[PDB]
Amino acid sequence: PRDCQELFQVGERQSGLFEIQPQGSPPFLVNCKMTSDGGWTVIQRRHDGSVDFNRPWEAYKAGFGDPHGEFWLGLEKVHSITGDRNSRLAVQLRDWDGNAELLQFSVHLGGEDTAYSLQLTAPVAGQLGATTVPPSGLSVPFSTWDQDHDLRRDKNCAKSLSGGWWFGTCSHSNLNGQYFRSIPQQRQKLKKGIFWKTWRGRYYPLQATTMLIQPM
Numbered sequence: 001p002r003d004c005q006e007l008f009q010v011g012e013r014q015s016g017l018f019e020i021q022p023q024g025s026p027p028f029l030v031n032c033k034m035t036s037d038g039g040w041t042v043i044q045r046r047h048d049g050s051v052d053f054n055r056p057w058e059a060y061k062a063g064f065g066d067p068h069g070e071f072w073l074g075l076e077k078v079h080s081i082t083g084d085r086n087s088r089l090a091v092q093l094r095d096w097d098g099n100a101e102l103l104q105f106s107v108h109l110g111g112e113d114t115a116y117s118l119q120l121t122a123p124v125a126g127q128l129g130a131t132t133v134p135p136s137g138l139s140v141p142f143s144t145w146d147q148d149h150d151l152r153r154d155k156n157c158a159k160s161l162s163g164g165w166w167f168g169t170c171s172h173s174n175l176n177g178q179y180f181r182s183i184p185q186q187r188q189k190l191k192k193g194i195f196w197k198t199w200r201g202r203y204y205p206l207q208a209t210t211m212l213i214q215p216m
């Protein structure tokens with residue numbers, strides 16, 4: 001089977017670890033979530049800060065962490081699942097009072113030759129906050145501290161924050177930032193945290209995050 005939706009389609013009901021083999025790829029183990037809307041591949045999960053997410057490009061390309069805990073599936077693995085297909089990207093956030101916010105966007109995801117860019121239509125970039133975006137849409141490369149795509153020549157967004165992310169701006173989101181349990185006092189600290197600006201604010205550190213994907 002090529003992904004979690006294909007496992008769902010042949011009748012798999014249980015969420016957990018499963019072997020898939022996307023086309024052109026060796027087999028590997030993924031976290032599948034089986035829902036009423038088919039199978040979803042978990043590509044990122046964070047809940048307790050046990051796993052260090054401040055990692056360079058090759059770790060973000062290959063994947064890291066604990067498949068039974070916090071992890072990053074890995075951009076190369078994620079792109080072998082999406083191919084060049086339109087995909088649903090689910091983003092689930094938890095704040096410190098147990099409130100959850102469930103978001104979903106249609107995206108395309110490019111290969112490494114695009115630096116694993118997120119490709120958004122103008123309406124979807126509108127959903128995320130972009131106000132002026134041509135009909136050709138928006139393309140946001142992935143960045144890590146050793147491979148940052150900020151065009152400002154003296155500005156490295158990933159190195160200034162933490163982790164790897166599609167830093168369209170350096171102020172929209174970062175679910176791969178540093179895990180914080182409470183109020184940090186050090187100048188320029190909560191800026192490095194796990195945040196999604198339009199939900200709880202630029203400086204609110206989220207308690208838990210899950211990102212999932214489903215091609216088509």
Ligand SMILES: CCCCCCCCCCCCCC(=O)O
Nearest residue numbers: 128129130140166168169171172
């Ligand atoms: C689903 C992950 C989204 C990754 C970030 C791409 C968002 C494109 C930029 C959105 C507009 C930025 C506006 C802002 O900084 O508040």
